[PDB]
Amino acid sequence: DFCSERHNCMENSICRNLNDRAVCSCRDGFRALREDNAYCEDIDECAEGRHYCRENTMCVNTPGSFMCICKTGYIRIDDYSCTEHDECITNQHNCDENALCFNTVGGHNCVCKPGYTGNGTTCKAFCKDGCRNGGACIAANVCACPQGFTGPSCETDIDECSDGFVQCDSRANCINLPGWYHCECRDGYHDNGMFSPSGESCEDIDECGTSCANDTICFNLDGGYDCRCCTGHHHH
Amino acid sequence: SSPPGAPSQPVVTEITKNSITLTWKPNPQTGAAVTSYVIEAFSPAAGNTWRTVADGVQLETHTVSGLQPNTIYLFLVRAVGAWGLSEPSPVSEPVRTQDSS
Ligand SMILES: *[C@@H]1O[C@H](CO[C@@H]2O[C@@H](C)[C@@H](O)[C@@H](O)[C@@H]2O)[C@@H](O[C@@H]2O[C@H](CO)[C@@H](O)[C@H](O)[C@H]2NC(C)=O)[C@H](O)[C@H]1NC(C)=O
Ligand SMILES: *[C@@H]1O[C@H](CO)[C@@H](O)[C@H](O)[C@H]1NC(C)=O
Ligand SMILES: [Ca+2]
Ligand SMILES: [Ca+2]
Ligand SMILES: [Ca+2]
């Protein structure tokens, strides 16, 4: 510690103990007056022409720093600027629901929150892996899915034949499809109406109209195709 | 007789639950000798003012620590020349600090 022994530094200078010397330097906010950094004076940030304080402020010089008071009718943006009107008070926002607002000199600025995209006035939810099969991205990394799908990207199909759900019973079979399901008639059944969301549309066909055997009376049945006189068969 | 130009939009690099790293570039038309940079932060949970979190910075990179977990922040940088401070840089994109366990 050479600075402790000799080579004194003035009160406005910081003594830096060195190995091959004992050098003085000024403190932050002070400017050296002599050749060596012996005695230094505070810099006057409020001097004529200096714009350390920016829009709508009044400068106050302190030893080593400075501060800026807002002009009377103005509200503060930061330590160096103020604006005329708080242009985004709460519940009145000119920005989006999922957006931010900070005051600027001469107005305001709107930016969307993390997980959203847009221009502040309108923000849309962003989904990294995206939504699929017609789903919507309602929140950040959250997809809303149509009735027939599920999964974080609406990529999994709901098995409507195994989820209970539709009891495609009676004269039809449940057949799962990507996004929905079918209710297809069993063997020996035809669809009466145009279609139906269940097995109620399927009807028995006249199962020997315009088969059987060369010599066989033909009878109808709910799913049957009967032939008798020789053959005495009982179909389904 | 003019302050320096405004720096470029700062970029967010390292994101923890208590700190954030910033990277900015000086203005292509700086116009006046820059001495240091001033970093300002913004949090909607804190208020509607920009807290000055760093001054006297000499490199174009700085790590703002002492932050709060699970909180949104924004940032901007001012150049500092012989005739005052620059206009603020474009505000950085919003980022949210990580959460604990
Ligand atoms: C902010 O953006 C909105 C909507 O623009 C949309 O989003 C953009 C990111 C881009 O993808 C555009 O192609 C989109 O159309 C602007 O607003 C109008 O919004 C109404 C409904 O809200 C819509 O019917 C109009 O088409 C939109 N007009 C335009 C030109 O897009 C809004 O003007 C933008 N604000 C600013 C300040 O630019
Ligand atoms: C899939 O979506 C359905 C709603 O259609 C929901 O009941 C189910 O819990 C979801 N499953 C998964 C793994 O997302
Ligand atoms: Ca001073
Ligand atoms: Ca299905
Ligand atoms: Ca029949």
Numbering used by the authors:
A (entry chain B): 399 to 608, 612 to 630, 636 to 642
B (entry chain A): 553 to 653
What did the study's authors say about this model?
Robo family receptors are type I transmembrane proteins that instruct neuronal wiring in various organisms, including worms, flies, mice, and humans, in addition to fulfilling diverse functions outside the nervous system. While Robo1 and Robo2 function as classical Slit receptors, the divergent family member Robo3 does not bind Slits and instead acts as a negative regulator of Robo1/2-mediated Slit repulsion. Further, a recently identified Robo3 ligand, NELL2, signals axon repulsion. NELL2 is a secreted glycoprotein containing a laminin G-like (LamG) domain, a coiled coil (CC) domain, and six epidermal growth factor-like (EGF) domains, flanked by five von Willebrand factor type C (VWC) domains.
